[PDB]
Amino acid sequence: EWTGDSSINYYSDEVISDFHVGQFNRSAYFCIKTVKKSGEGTPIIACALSHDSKWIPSFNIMLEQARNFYITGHSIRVYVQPNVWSNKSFIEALSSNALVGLSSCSTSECFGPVK
């Protein structure tokens, strides 16, 4: 598995607008809500769990990077995997997308794997 795989969607030129942290079934988790800069609509919510899914190893690096990007408000690309979380209450509360990657988007291009 890799954040550059075809199963991974990504949204570029995002800004992390909302940050949430909590615990879900013995797993520390954090969710980020990112929006297009200048407000193009349909905000994207991506969550990562510390002790669930195959994306466990990158939970801490993803959490620190998401915190840094929320602090700076810098335009970034979010790599998510759809349909990773299955708990219905968690799904409707935040999302089913797993936050699996983050890359700096410096206006001309944007770093990280593409399609």
């Binding site: 915190r67 840094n68 929320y70 602090i71 700076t72 408000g73 810098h74």
Partner: protein
């Protein structure tokens, strides 16, 4: 708030005669908060930065007396806050509502400064008293010293303006700029030369305080690593 504080090297005579004057005409709030318009950068800010926290004054005195290249006396001047004194937070909220972006670095720095900006020059009539900050080398601590009472103080009983700074320049697109800080995350606008140090041609010659970038410090304390 009322009775903000300002640390100045000039003796109470000079300040009670002249007060504090604006460095320049740069009204941009982002350059003020990040310190680009203050002594660290452009040095033409159209604000006089003061603090309502006595502890921030102690921190400024600590930094200047600990850099060990600074020689001379420091005085805390107690200024009555009139309607020309504005808190940073309402104006920052207004600029954010107007499309401006203040990252968490600026938010943290503003929260640490307890900052109040005078859009006009601080007249001597607004200054209550000057407290000398004696730096004894025995224990290396700053002691509040002689308290000189200004005889030109008016006691208007005014309060700081709780509104938004008028005629704020249009907020520029965010570029994640350097935030000038000295001592223990003291904004560079609290430095000696962030206000006009010229006094009828008698410009005080004191140590230029070096400023570090506050963003790495704020990141360091936000995330314990």
């Amino acid at each position: 708030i009322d009775f903000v504080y300002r640390v100045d090297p000039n003796p109470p005579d000079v300040i009670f005669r002249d007060g504090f004057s604006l460095l320049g005409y740069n009204r941009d709030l982002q350059q003020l908060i990040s310190g680009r318009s203050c002594a660290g950068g452009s040095s033409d800010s159209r604000y006089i930065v003061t603090t309502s926290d006595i502890n921030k004054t102690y921190a400024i005195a600590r930094a200047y007396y600990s850099h060990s290249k600074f020689k001379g006396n420091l005085y805390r001047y107690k200024i009555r806050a009139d309607n020309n004194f504005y808190s940073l937070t309402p104006s920052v909220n207004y600029l954010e509502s107007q499309g401006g972006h203040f990252n968490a670095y600026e938010k943290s720095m503003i929260r640490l400064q307890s900052e109040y900006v005078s859009t006009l020059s601080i007249l001597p009539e607004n200054i209550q008293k000057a407290v000398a900050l004696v730096y004894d080398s025995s224990t290396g601590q700053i002691k509040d010293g002689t308290s000189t009472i200004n005889t030109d103080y008016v006691s208007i009983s005014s309060v700081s303006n709780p509104g938004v700074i008028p005629f704020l320049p249009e907020p520029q697109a965010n570029t994640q700029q350097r935030i000038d800080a000295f001592g223990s995350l003291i904004s560079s606008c609290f430095s000696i030369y962030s206000v006009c140090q010229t006094h009828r041609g008698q410009k005080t010659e004191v140590y230029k305080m070096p400023f570090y970038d506050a963003r790495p410090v704020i990141q360091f304390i936000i995330s314990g690593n």
